[PDB]
Amino acid sequence: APVWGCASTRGRSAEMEDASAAVPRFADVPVRLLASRRDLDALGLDADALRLPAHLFGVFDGHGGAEVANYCRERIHVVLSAALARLGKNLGEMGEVDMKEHWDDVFTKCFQRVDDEVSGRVTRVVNGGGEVRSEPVTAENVGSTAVVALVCSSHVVVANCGDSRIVLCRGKEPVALSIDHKPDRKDERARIEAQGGKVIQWNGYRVSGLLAMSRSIGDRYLKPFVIPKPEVMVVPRAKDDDCLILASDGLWDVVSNEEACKVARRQILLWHKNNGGSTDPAAQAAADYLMRLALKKGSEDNITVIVVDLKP
Amino acid sequence: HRHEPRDHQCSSAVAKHIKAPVHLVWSLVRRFDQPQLFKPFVSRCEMKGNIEIGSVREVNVKSGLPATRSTERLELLDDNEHILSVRFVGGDHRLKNYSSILTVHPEVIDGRPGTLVIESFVVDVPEGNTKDETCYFVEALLKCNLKSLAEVSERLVV
Numbered sequence: 001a002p003v004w005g006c007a008s009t010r011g012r013s014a015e016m017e018d019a020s021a022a023v024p025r026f027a028d029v030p031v032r033l034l035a036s037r038r039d040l041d042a043l044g045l046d047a048d049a050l051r052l053p054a055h056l057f058g059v060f061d062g063h064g065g066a067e068v069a070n071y072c073r074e075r076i077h078v079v080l081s082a083a084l085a086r087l088g089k090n091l092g093e094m095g096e097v098d099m100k101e102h103w104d105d106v107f108t109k110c111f112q113r114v115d116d117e118v119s120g121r122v123t124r125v126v127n128g129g130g131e132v133r134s135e136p137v138t139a140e141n142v143g144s145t146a147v148v149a150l151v152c153s154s155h156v157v158v159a160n161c162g163d164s165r166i167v168l169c170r171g172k173e174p175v176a177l178s179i180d181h182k183p184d185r186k187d188e189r190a191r192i193e194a195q196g197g198k199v200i201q202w203n204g205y206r207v208s209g210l211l212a213m214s215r216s217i218g219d220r221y222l223k224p225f226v227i228p229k230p231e232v233m234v235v236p237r238a239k240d241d242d243c244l245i246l247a248s249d250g251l252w253d254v255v256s257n258e259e260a261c262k263v264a265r266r267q268i269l270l271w272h273k274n275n276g277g278s279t280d281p282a283a284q285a286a287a288d289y290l291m292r293l294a295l296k297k298g299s300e301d302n303i304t305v306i307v308v309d310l311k312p
Numbered sequence: 313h314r315h316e317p318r319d320h321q322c323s324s325a326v327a328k329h330i331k332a333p334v335h336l337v338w339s340l341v342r343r344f345d346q347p348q349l350f351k352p353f354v355s356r357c358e359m360k361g362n363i364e365i366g367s368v369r370e371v372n373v374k375s376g377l378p379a380t381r382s383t384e385r386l387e388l389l390d391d392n393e394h395i396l397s398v399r400f401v402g403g404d405h406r407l408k409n410y411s412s413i414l415t416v417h418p419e420v421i422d423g424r425p426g427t428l429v430i431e432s433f434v435v436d437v438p439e440g441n442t443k444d445e446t447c448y449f450v451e452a453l454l455k456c457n458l459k460s461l462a463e464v465s466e467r468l469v470v
């Protein structure tokens with residue numbers, strides 16, 4: 001049902017700490033978060049009973065280790081899918097509600113839940129029942145970005161935590177769907193300093209002079225300055241839409257938004273002109289191209305690219 | 313623990329109570345060739361020869377930091393008086409002329425034998441920063457190290 005490609009490499013680094021997830025039909029989106037019950041009652045349709053499939057895509061740039069990025073790959077889509085089914089029922093005996101504010105809650109409480117599992121603040125289930133673990137997943141200096149996009153036929157919902165990024169090409173011109181959580185961002189400095197922390201310029205603006213981002217999963221040794229709260233944006237799809245690009249800093253450090261969009265469209269069209277849970281050859285070709293464009297431009301970091309085609 | 317910071321330098325210290333006997337803690341601190349035994353930020357460490365004054369370890373740190381490698385020389389290692397002094401003499405980091413002193417002391421904690429660890433340092437203030445920023449940067453790392461030291465120590469008692 002969903003058309004995507006994923007290119008991922010160790011790159012010129014000794015170890016791989018990037019992780020990614022692409023889960024088709026991972027959940028059904030409660031339509032009550034996309035449209036009001038009254039508008040649908042006027043058509044005779046029951047918003048609570050309406051089925052709309054969604055897909056999840058995620059990129060997790062680990063730092064200090066791969067274990068938290070890997071844990072995000074394995075748990076976010078599961079925690080999220082369960083929250084959406086629970087929310088779908090609680091809307092039964094509920095009235096109208098702020099959809100913006102409910103998308104914030106479900107993604108925030110989801111990221112917060114994976115962060116709480118990673119740090120040990122809650123017990124977590126292994127071996128699909130029977131086993132439980134309560135000790136932290138790993139040391140307190142390991143973390144990971146999380147940029148995830150929930151995709152259905154009518155909307156793209158985006159949740160970002162860290163300096164990974166997702167970019168939408170709408171109308172052959174790029175649109176940033178996330179804003180990097182660099183610690184020198186005016187509002188992030190204000191937040192960190194209000195907490196009693198410091199944003200120090202130390203080979204780049206860093207929290208406590210250490211971490212080059214203001215939000216992430218894990219990294220409990222930098223709390224409460226570094227936090228897992230994501231920025232959520234709900235983006236109605238349009239006839240203009242070209243594609244979706246999720247990537248780690250391994251790509252965005254050497255490729256601009258404009259360039260990443262231009263190359264993605266071209267590679268998808270380029271593949272269709274020459275040719276009149278599995279990946280799509282055209283999106284894949286755009287993902288492999290963007291990965292190699294990052295290596296050919298001198299990127300020394302891990303590189304992870306997901307391309308999602310928004311047209312056919 | 314008396315350092316004399318020069319005009320172009322800062323200095324501070326951090327302490328930690330460990331619920332383990334001195335001999336147990338110090339057995340971990342003294343292995344100058346394996347600081348990854350308690351430092352969560354170390355990924356690799358190389359050293360030739362016996363641990364002795366003048367020994368040099370080449371440390372590689374994990375990702376997510378402002379640096380990747382430092383070269384460190386053992387300045388002082390007293391096994392009767394539990395003292396360890398290290399100096400950073402190379403690397404690609406911004407801690408020039410870093411020097412630390414670490415000591416372990418016996419103590420009674422909750423009716424059992426325990427340990428107090430004290431670590432102080434002096435380092436040049438890098439170009440563009442303040443004494444306060446530099447001390448904050450180091451204390452955050454040291455507090456984390458002594459945090460890890462306490463965990464591993466208290467785990468060896470069981």
Ligand SMILES: CC1=CC(=O)CC(C)(C)[C@@]1(O)/C=C/C(C)=C\C(=O)O
Binds near residue numbers: 351353406
């Ligand atoms: C954690 C880290 C990051 C740097 O930017 C410098 C350096 C690589 C030296 C360091 O290993 C510093 C470690 C410190 C201050 C103390 C220690 O280890 O006892």
Ligand SMILES: [Mg+2]
Binds near residue numbers: 017018062063302375
């Ligand atoms: Mg990384």
Ligand SMILES: [Mg+2]
Binds near residue numbers: 061249301302
């Ligand atoms: Mg990276």
